[PDB]
Symmetry: C6
Subunit: 221 residues, 6 copies
């Protein structure tokens, strides 16, 4: 990675053994549960493309998912090239060549070139660009690998309201719909698919009640 050291300057160092192991274990334990994605982001903080590739390549198994991720990365890289066409010419002293998509994904660039772009003035944050592309691919996999739909989450007749809400928001997190759609699902389905007793009590609260108030309302039900 690259980190702001104890002077304010930015410097390169290798990924720590513990970071590597943490990432490998996360994938082994949690597979593609939604919380894996922010764990990926945290563990890859300040990463170069080489560092990000290291993390992805250290995964054994799940090679359908890793292949899907590769294809998503290829799509993003091709899009980058279209928007940012590389201009032919000899690179001047004290200047970096313009990165292609494959340079951003770390397949046709060296570590020094990556370091060159990331610490340039102005910086070309190639690590953060690639990480954006990776996270897009991870989101696609999390959706793909989710078993349930939000339309199927229904409160059981003896089910504590808190457990139903836990299942509701777990499933919602895996859905790849925008925030406005997620707001509608919260506004519409949560109360609609609650059990008869709770549902009546929540209808009586009326529009605009908080989740806290809803959970306190259906607590002894």
């Amino acid at each position: 990675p690259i980190v702001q050291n104890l002077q304010g300057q930015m410097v390169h160092q290798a990924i720590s053994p513990r970071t590597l192991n943490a990432w490998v274990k996360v994938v082994e334990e949690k597979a593609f549960s939604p919380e894996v994605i922010p764990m990926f982001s945290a563990l890859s903080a300040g990463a170069t493309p080489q560092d990000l590739n290291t993390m992805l390549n250290t995964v054994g198994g799940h090679q359908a998912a890793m292949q899907m991720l590769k294809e998503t990365i290829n799509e993003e890289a091709a899009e980058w090239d279209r928007l940012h066409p590389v201009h032919a010419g000899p690179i001047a002293p004290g200047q970096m060549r313009e990165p292609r998509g494959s340079d951003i994904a770390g397949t046709t660039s060296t570590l020094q070139e990556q370091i060159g772009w990331m610490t340039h003035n102005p910086p070309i944050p190639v690590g953060e660009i690639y990480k954006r592309w990776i996270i897009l691919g991870l989101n696609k996999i999390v959706r793909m690998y989710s078993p349930t739909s939000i339309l199927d989450i229904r409160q059981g007749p003896k089910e504590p309201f808190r457990d139903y809400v836990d299942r509701f928001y777990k499933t919602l997190r895996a859905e790849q719909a925008s925030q406005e759609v997620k707001n509608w699902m919260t506004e519409t389905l949560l109360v609609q698919n609650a059990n008869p007793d709770c549902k009546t009590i929540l209808k009586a609260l009326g529009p605009g009640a908080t989740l806290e108030e809803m959970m306190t309302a259906c607590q002894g039900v």
Copy 2:
């Protein structure tokens, strides 16, 4: 996070793998027991909003609680906006834009903007503001998820006084009443809800006896 390095200057670095893992395990093991909140605060020391979001987003399950936390954060952010209305105008050289609530919660600000505010002169401690909002939400969850009321904690006839006091103060810690109310509960209920034998001995001590003296008094009872 951001920490005072070995010169006196403040510098950014990523959240350590061990910090991340410590937080995830704390939540897995202890759920929303009161001691989780100071553990959160300790692990999030010097955190940026991005770091704080990382910690919250790495939790799998408990999504009813995490949704309640989000709503509490939205309420605080809306309150901040009301008190601190952003003034329209082009931002001058060597100046930061005024943060909205969503900038403080790390959803509409970048890491560099967050770093910009936190290390400014004078500093806008956006990490500590957001952490205050998070802890408010955590306190609400701890209350919500507490099984027992302080009014129900009664000493059993053969129960050692020390075990009753342990149960009393555990339950008291989860209550979300102010210090003056907590003082009244200590002054009123502890002796009132003790068992007949101990209760008589503690009445005989009179007003203003210490807990130590009370525990020594009822020791062989």
Copy 3:
């Protein structure tokens, strides 16, 4: 905490995850055995009041003991205020306000104020003052939670002398009597409460024999 960094200057940093976890496990495993207190001191080296509060607040359970500790801290803080009455007036540029007891215990002071006092010229070692108060409270708890009295430690007829000495000095360590009283207990009781055979052999050594000599003397008995 605060530590003398690699230049000689003192700088603030957060409590390490491992420190926090070490402290939590110590309390879980050993409860209030005497060795917990030096472990507390070691783990809290260079701590600010905020750091010390973090350590105490991260304990779940044992809330009778933690309440007793709070009360002891209140007593010490009230004593400090009596000895050090705060003088009213506007604080000058390049000067710190005088700390009250509650500032020392970290309840009415900020982290920056704490850092202000601890690194001042001359320093007001607020961390070490508070730690002294905490350790007083811990000593009271260790005494309270000790099962046995030193007067009851008697060597069994077939008990190896070394095992009796182990029990003797374990129990002695939990007693809250001064060194001169502890010297008298060693001088008087150890030989007095030994078993008939050993006791005769130790009487024959006479006054002023070392523990080593006593243990070698009763070895094959």
Copy 4:
């Protein structure tokens, strides 16, 4: 290893105990699965030849594989010598001798000479040269130790398409054919060796469908 320290300068330090142990455990657990190679690369970041030899020599067992690796290293070293014949003459002040293959592999060079080459202007990246040779040998071993051929991976009649794809791309990763050949295997065999029902559905998608689309298509089959 050697790493860009907190000034921008490069400095030597020993391999960490955790790095060593991580490498030993990786080999113990995963043997020569493909993901071992990027784990090797990550753990050996900034390594000197002495460091790389340490990692290889710490492996107990697998000595057929380690012997094959030695022979591959000898072949590469002999090739280097042919391309880079060492010119006889006394080495001038402020100059390094030209490295032979055995100097690159760390068998006839000292640590200081290795450090001399790696930090020279221009640098002779002897660590990265040797690592390239090692990885060539590791790739040969991974191929050798792979049980299955990509031509034998066929979807079972009741096998979920996702599990077949996992097996397909696991086996493909162990094959030592170029990217163009791997593209042909993906284009040709994946659909060809799918089960009758899925195979018909994938033929209907037509040329140029993505893996994601293929996996969504055969999901309920």
Copy 5:
């Protein structure tokens, strides 16, 4: 401890949690086996008296041994005072007071005074003086707690010579006789107390054979 930092200057820091835990576990696992003493020395490298006291005070149980250690420390401290009598007078600016034995053992000196002595010009290595005294006491305990005498180590009739030598040198290590006495034990007893067959073969080697030669000689016996 105190360590030569990255400039050449010496600086104070607290004992690491891992150091503390390592020491506590060593004592729990190995009790007072001879190898505990060099482990103590290693873990206490650059320690102040306060640090050394921390390590000793964190031991729970073994309080007979810890009391013996205290008494040995008192004897050494009294000897120091006799050799180094403190001269009465007001301490000058830029000068340290002369340490008594109790200052060296860390019971009547502060951390800053300890740091004062250890970093003085010329240094008064109070940490290393105290550690010498501690190790003397540990050696006494290891002897005390050794079950066997070197005179009783005799090779069994079917016992491999290598196992007998292991037992011989284990027991020898616990003996508190000087090197010249230990040389005589090696020269005299090892061959003398070997079994009839081996003993004859070793007599035939004659005076001045190495241990290696002796072990190769009796290998198939």
Copy 6:
């Protein structure tokens, strides 16, 4: 140890708890398997003689081997003295005394003297000299403690060729013959002591076939 810090200067620090523990566990688990020696070297990187003695002295048990190691160290030290006779005279300002063998082995030198030699201009690498002597002794022990001879490694009639090669090269690694002798063993015995079927197939390859080719040849046999 001593390491090139973040300025280029060399500085002393104590052996890390994890290094110590890693070494102790290595010896406990793997005894004197050949891979222990490079693990020793790695863990002792930049070590002073005091550090190297710490590592050897922390081993409990195996005292026959540790005694053999001591004797080998005495032989090397006596050889050093013969080659480097110490010249009598008062040591000048800004000069180090000439080290004897016992100074190199860390038994008659102080830590500061060791540091004096290792950081001198030109340096006297006393740590690396002693480590060479230790490794000589370790090699002798590994040979001594090897059960099998390379002449006895014969392929079983149903034994996969890869497993035979693993056993062959494991045993070869423990032999203390030079590289030219090891080359002859590879050239002569491997094919000679293979099973009838494989042996015929390997004879047909002819002189100069690689191990890889040999292993591919006998794969389905």
